[model samples]
Target: MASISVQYRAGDGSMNSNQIRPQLQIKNNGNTTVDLKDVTARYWYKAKNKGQNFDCDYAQIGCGNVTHKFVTLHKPKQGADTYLELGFKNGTLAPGASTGNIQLRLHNDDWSNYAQSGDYSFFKSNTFKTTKKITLYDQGKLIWGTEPN
Candidate 1:
């Protein structure tokens, strides 16, 4: 079986909202390179008019024209939160491969609310007041691995 792990690193800060910054990382623990599929990160935060509690996906975090050779990204609407993607439909990972840092910007605006409802089904903490949690998926199935903090 393929082995992988996910992480939530806070070293960098997001520029979109109130100095908010969060990144989702993935590491390949297998000894050989593997074909990648897709990964998802989910969380909860309050929606408001301004400076409001906000959270978002990787698409919202632009990386200044970095050539993404591995995957195509998409931001789809889920039950509540916006679904972000690192699609490997035409990509693959080498041994010891890892998504360095995927810092997502915040968007709690009305347009965002209208475009995508905020779903907290995967928050795990049972409340939006908890830390924004993430989930990693491959081939539409949960990776089922422990986090690295």
Candidate 2:
């Protein structure tokens, strides 16, 4: 099995979010290098007893759908805050390799409007998982793993 580790860094490059920049560190912990094709980050307003989908709503306002892009990373601070998705199609990473620092800023205007009543809290979505090809060997026999495994 492949292991993936994610470390969140608030604006200050720590675990705190007092600053305006939030950084995410995705690391591959396997023996072989893995390819990172894309990265997505999403944000939503906290509600009571209900999980509101941010990506669906954000798309309505023309801010761009989370699944519509092929960016290696997303900087949501430049756009309005409903939900953000960053994707990458031609990106690759080596075994135990990681990407450079990703800087994401929060769009104050969008966030303010979403939090106008101050009754809801803001939250970032969890990191998403993607497929990585791997090879296996048993008793000198070679095998390859494909998607839909």
Candidate 3:
């Protein structure tokens, strides 16, 4: 059986509280072919208080809802107030073949104003059954894998 591996890297080289443009590189590391579908990048800020979920759109409100903000693959227009989404639809990878790097910019509103000077985490999710996983990171440090089981 073959397995697929996906990796992400921020443009600033660090997933910190400061504003940044996030970029990702998806690779097929298995021995067989694999398909990628419904690939989306979703992220949220880490709340200072445990068990406190802050909304991505409106972090100050404390809605406890993990917002799934959409992003695009193309470079947004200058001063454009929009999110970017990038992914492959049924993208076929034949044993080590890799796709181009996908890029997206992070808007200022997504970050929490109340965020302390501590580490903050972000998440990315894949909807496909074979790719059903969430990668978590804290200020450039990979703290966990595949979400909390």
lDDT per residue (tens digit) for residues 78-129 in model 3: 2222333233334566788754444444434435443322222233334211
lDDT of 3: 0.38
Tens-digit lDDT track of model 2 for 1-149? 43444444333332232223334444566676544443333322212222222222221112331232211123222222233333333444566775544445543322332232221112233542232221122222322222111
Please give the TM-score that candidate 3 achieves against the real structure: 0.43
The local lDDT score (0 to 100) that residue 129 gets in candidate 3 is: 19
Preferred candidate (TM-score higher): 1 or 3: 1
State which candidate, 2 or 3, has the greater lDDT.
Answer: 3
Which lDDT tens digits does candidate 1 get at residues 65-135?
A: 11221121233233322333334333455668865555545444333332212333232222122122445
Question: How high is the CA lDDT of each candidate model?
Answer: 0.41, 0.33, 0.38
Off by over 4 Å in 2: 13-20, 38-83, 108-149
Q: Which segments of candidate 1 are over 4 A away from where they belong?
A: 11-20, 43-90, 110-133, 145-149
- Predictions ranked by lDDT, top down? 1, 3, 2
The TM-scores, one per candidate, come to 0.47, 0.40, 0.43
What TM-score does candidate 1 reach?
0.47
Q: Sorted on TM-score, highest at the top, how do the candidates line up? A: 1, 3, 2
lDDT of 1 at 101: 54
